[PDB]
């Protein structure tokens, strides 16, 4: 899942990055710590999505 955001603009990409860092990351880690989390792949996939979005931002903005 990369092409659906490869063509997005900087502002919307940053908004998506902020949304991903706020939701599904802080709540996910809190749930995992509290033990209410049942599936652990959520953290891995959200972290990989964050890394992918950061890479796209680095590639687009600047260079």
């Amino acid at each position: 899942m990369k092409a659906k955001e490869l063509r997005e603009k900087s502002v919307e990409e940053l908004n998506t990055e902020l949304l991903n860092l706020l939701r599904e990351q802080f709540n996910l880690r809190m749930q995992a710590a509290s033990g209410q989390l049942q599936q652990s792949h959520l953290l891995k996939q959200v972290r990989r999505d964050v890394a992918r979005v950061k890479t796209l931002l680095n590639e687009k903005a600047g260079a």
């Binding site: 990055e17 902020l18 860092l21 706020l22 990351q25 802080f26 880690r29 809190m30 995992a32 710590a33 509290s34």
Partner: protein, 93 residues
Amino acid sequence: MIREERLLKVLRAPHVSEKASTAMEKSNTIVLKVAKDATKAEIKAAVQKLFEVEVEVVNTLVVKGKVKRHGQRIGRRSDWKKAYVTLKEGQNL
């Protein structure tokens, strides 16, 4: 502006223990895991933004990791910091 994402990242997990429960029920304060640096101002801002509550003051401390042995291999636990954030009279969590 990376202040928002820094505030998101500074907080790692909450802390649960008998002392934590006693402080929560008595002093209306919550103890939770924080980043290794986790400066007081950043912790206060992150708590304010995420928990949408009012905090009186934050005092932190660094916990030294214990030395444990798996098999015969010595293995020091990773160090971590905990912050005792004191909430206002109005508490949510």
